[PDB]
């Protein structure tokens, strides 16, 4: 009775999983509202909390559990299936139960992931402006060899205005926009020169507290498909650098139109993992 | 005041102190605007807003 969300076959993650590559030996950190570790479809093997009074393995918001499910929901005969179901999943709590976060909280989480041997970082979060400490943190993570992925933003389009937020706007970070089930750009998906790739972000069905599921919209939903795709590539080719994984994702993307609206296009992990 | 929000798209319509209507990408963004800028708002039905989103005025 396992549910396969449309996003899994759309990015061709089912084709890579059928090859026997499911993210084994790859460590992915989800920097978010935490993860409901007690959810049957999620195996959280570590992490850290930078939110006072809250442990990393609980999620009082829901957002982080949903994002984690897209990356890593277990391949079992029930529940939902994630992009890279054999990944080692780490919950890095940088957002509180209301969804809000500080720059120091996000920096602390980025640094923890870098120091703790994470292969991939997912950041389904953003702001209109970044900070010197955040730019340093993502530059260090990427230089160390971490594939850094973030939601581009949900500010849509307004003529020629660049609507990409931070950390997605940083050169060291992959900015991910959103498409629907017909591979059309979602109207809310942010646009700009920094837009790198697209992934499913409309009506994404995933894990949600407590022991349930939810259908959500956002570039927050698109970002984990790319983080998960990076992990599938790395389980197949473990010796690749972060730059090499990043170029594999952008160079093999399905062209959809102008780079301003779609970046390189929709990720195709089967082609990326060749 | 919290500077970072999740990138969930769950738009909400608010009415400012100057009686103008703004559609924010989510409740977190409305709260951020209120905290950082001292912005005054009240939630109202979606129909009061334009179909497109606005940033913190």
DSSP three-state, residue A68: helix
Residues A155 and B56: their CA atoms lie apart, in Å, by 12
Q: How was this structure determined?
A: X-ray
A156, B28: Cβ pair inside 8 Å? no
Rounded to the nearest 5 degrees, what angle is found at the Cα of A160, between the Cα atoms of A158 and A162?
80
The answer to whether A170 is a known ligand-binding residue is yes
* Residues of chain B positioned with their CB less than 8 A from the CB of A155: 25, 53, 55
Buried b (16+ CB within 10 A) or exposed e, A43-58: bbeebbbbbeebebbb
| Number of neighbours of residue A251 by Cβ within 10 angstroms | 10
A32 is catalytic: yes
HSE at residue A99, side-chain half, CA atoms within 13 A, is 22
Note if the bond before A257 is cis, omega within 30 degrees: no
Burial-class residue A239 by CB neighbours within 10 Å (0-12, 13-18, 19+): exposed
The answer to whether A234 is a known ligand-binding residue is no
Q: What is the CATH number of the domain that holds A187?
A: 3.40.50.200
A74 Cβ neighbours under 8 A, 6+ residues apart:
A40, A41, A42, A43, A81, A82, A85
Cα–Cα distances (Å) from A6 to A77, A137, A196, in that order, read 17, 34, 22
- Nearest-CA residue of chain A relative to B53? A155
Q: What is the CATH number of the domain that holds B13?
A: 3.30.60.30
What's the gap in Å between the CA of A239 and the closest CA on chain B? 32
State the total domains in chain B: 1
- Find the catalytic residue in A39, A49, A59, A63: A63
- Find the catalytic residue in A49, A206, A220, A223: A220
State the total domains in chain A: 1
DSSP three-state, residue B48: helix
Q: Print the domain residue range for B54.
A: 1-57
Residues A4 and A38: their CA atoms lie apart, in Å, by 21
A225 is catalytic: no
Angle between helices A219-236 and A242-251 (to 10 degrees): 120
Residues in chain A whose beta carbon is closer than 8 A to a beta carbon of chain B? 32-33, 61, 63, 94-96, 98-103, 105-106, 124-128, 151, 153-156, 158, 186, 188, 201, 216-221, 223
Residues A171 and A164: their CA atoms lie apart, in Å, by 12
Two tokens, residue A27: 């460590």
Tell me the structure's resolution in angstroms, rounded to a single decimal.
1.8
Residues A107 and A139: their CA atoms lie apart, in Å, by 11
Q: Print the domain residue range for A246.
A: 1-274
In terms of residues, how long is chain B?
Answer: 57
Q: Which of B2, B7, B53 sits opposite A156 (nearest CB)?
A: B53
A220 is catalytic: yes
């Amino acid at each position: 009775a396992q549910t396969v969300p449309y996003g899994i076959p759309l990015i061709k993650a089912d084709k890579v999983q059928a090859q026997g590559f499911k993210g084994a030996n790859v460590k992915v950190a989800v920097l978010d509202t935490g993860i409901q570790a007690s959810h049957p479809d999620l195996n959280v093997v570590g992490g850290a909390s930078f939110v006072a009074g809250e442990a990393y393995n609980t999620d009082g918001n829901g957002h982080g559990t949903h994002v984690a499910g897209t990356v890593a929901a277990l391949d079992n005969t029930t529940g939902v299936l994630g992009v890279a179901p054999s990944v080692s999943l780490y919950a890095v709590k940088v957002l509180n139960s209301s969804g809000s976060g500080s720059y120091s909280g996000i920096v602390s989480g980025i640094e923890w992931a870098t120091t703790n041997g994470m292969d991939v970082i997912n950041m389904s979060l953003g702001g209109a402006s970044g900070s010197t400490a955040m730019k340093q943190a993502v530059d260090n993570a990427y230089a160390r060899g971490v594939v850094v992925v973030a939601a581009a933003g949900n500010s849509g389009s307004s003529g020629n205005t660049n609507t990409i937020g931070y950390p997605a706007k940083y050169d060291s970070v992959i900015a991910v926009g959103a498409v629907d089930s017909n591979s059309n750009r979602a109207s809310f998906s942010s646009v700009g020169a920094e837009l790198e790739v697209m992934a499913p972000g409309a009506g994404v069905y995933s894990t949600y507290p407590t022991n349930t599921y939810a259908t959500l919209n956002g570039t927050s939903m698109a970002s984990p498909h790319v983080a998960g795709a990076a992990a599938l590539i790395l389980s197949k080719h473990p010796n690749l650098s972060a730059s090499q994984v990043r170029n594999r994702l952008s160079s093999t993307a399905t062209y959809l139109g102008s780079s301003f609206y779609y970046g390189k296009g929709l990720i195709n992990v089967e082609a990326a993992a060749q | 005041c919290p500077s970072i929000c999740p990138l969930i798209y769950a738009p909400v319509c608010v009415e400012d102190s100057n009686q103008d209507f703004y559609l924010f990408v989510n409740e977190c963004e409305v709260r951020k605007c209120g905290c950082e800028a001292g912005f005054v708002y009240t939630f109202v039905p979606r129909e009061m807003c334009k179909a497109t989103t606005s940033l913190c005025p």
